[PDB]
């Protein structure tokens, strides 16, 4: 598309906004930028020629724009943007700008959880095939930074926020992994359903009806699931295989990923790669080489028959449910739950907490809430380190120590990554 002579305003000076700045500069267009923060750190990176307004949105600039490029996020709800729409001013996001300029097929992935694992893994399948692939979007580099005439395939992770502002995506294959929001619930689902519009192939979760396109399944749909679907899992005394269209394709022992959820992520990835035309042999190869992302049901230690699992990326009840459903534990599960639950209903976790082989170690702001799930088997401490010092002397060969806390880490940590890193350090110290 041609932006010459347009009055362009970018909202947001994070890396995504800066990518949009670079995008217009490269096309001879000097956009205006604004950010509600007083000193966003992107400031220091702007060219001198770019007019900037910070500390709030500038209504006059928005109302004078020919195009508003909105960084994705709660900012999309700001009443000044809504006023700009009412005046007929075009509003788009970086993903729309990208789709207009992309000169290679797009694989598009959204979902409440599993999206980064799946996006990365489809990336690795393309790399295994020798395909010049650009991987990013809502994870890694923002999408505009991936644009390159040499690119043969793009694999994008997309948020609901990004999809709200995207009208030009025609993915070669797209998925909603699952659906577990500023604009309300219907809006959240509706936004994800945008990903299927003009997608050649839709990869749906057989286990989550909300991932099905609006009007139902259609001829474009390929499913992945635990017990059934085009891509599913098959389990026979001691062994689990990925199964595709009726055929086992890989024993999971050949994969580095562990856990039912990552296996379904592997299936969804395979299905997207198969739909994108990637060769099957190299995509299987990638399944055997891919280590997994840190903090995503990641095995950080396995000594003396005890596996220590960092699932710190589980910051909500849906993520933890996904970690708990189909969990395989020979001996006792030692489950660490805690942090800032953000007023969540934890009860869905309770289904998974019966039997004689579960111990709970609860901590952080809402530790009390979490222990109340089954007080009989719960301890409560202030910190995860304290909880880990309680369980460590109790573990026995056969056990699993799982950090899947169902809460945000911000009461005690900088982010879920620091929480997982500390968990790994302590596991190594104690285990
Ligand atoms: Ni050892």
Numbering used by the authors: 1 to 180, 187 to 437
Question: What does the literature reporting this entry say, word for word?
Answer:
MurD catalyzes the addition of D-glutamic acid to UDP-MurNAc-L-Ala, generating the dipeptide moiety L-Ala-D-Glu in almost all bacterial species. From a structural point of view, Mur ligases are three-domain enzymes that share a very well conserved ATP-binding site that harbors the Gly-X-X-Gly-Lys-Thr/Ser motif and display notable structural similarities in terms of domain arrangement. The N-terminal domain is involved in the binding of the UDP-precursor, the central domain in the binding of ATP, and the C-terminal domain in the binding of the amino acid or dipeptide. Crystal structures of Mur ligases reveal that MurC, MurD and MurF display at least two distinct conformations, namely ‘open’ and ‘closed’, with the position of C-terminal domain dictating the nature of the conformation.
We achieved this by solving two intermediate conformations of MurD which we named Intermediate Free MurD (i.e., intermediate conformation of ligand-free MurD) and Intermediate Bound MurD (i.e., intermediate conformation of MurD with ligands). In the solving of Intermediate Free MurD, 421 residues were refined. There is one minor region missing between residues Thr180─Tyr187 since it could not be traced in the electron density map. Notably, Lys198 is not carbamoylated as it is the case in open MurD structures. Superposition to open unbound MurD structure revealed that the new structure was clearly in a distinct conformation. Only Arg302 was found to be differently oriented so we focused on this residue because of its position in the hinge loop containing residues from Thr294 to Glu304. There is a difference in the orientation of Arg302 as well as its interactions, when compared to the previously solved closed conformations of MurD and additionally orientation of Arg302 in Intermediate Free MurD is different from all of the orientations found in the aforementioned structures of MurD, which contributes towards the intermediate conformation adopted by the protein. Thus, we were able to ‘trap’ an intermediate conformation of MurD that is not open despite the absence of ligands, nor closed in the presence of ligands. This suggests that it is not substrate recognition which causes MurD closure, as previously suggested, but that domain movement is an inherent feature of the enzyme that is independent of ligand binding.
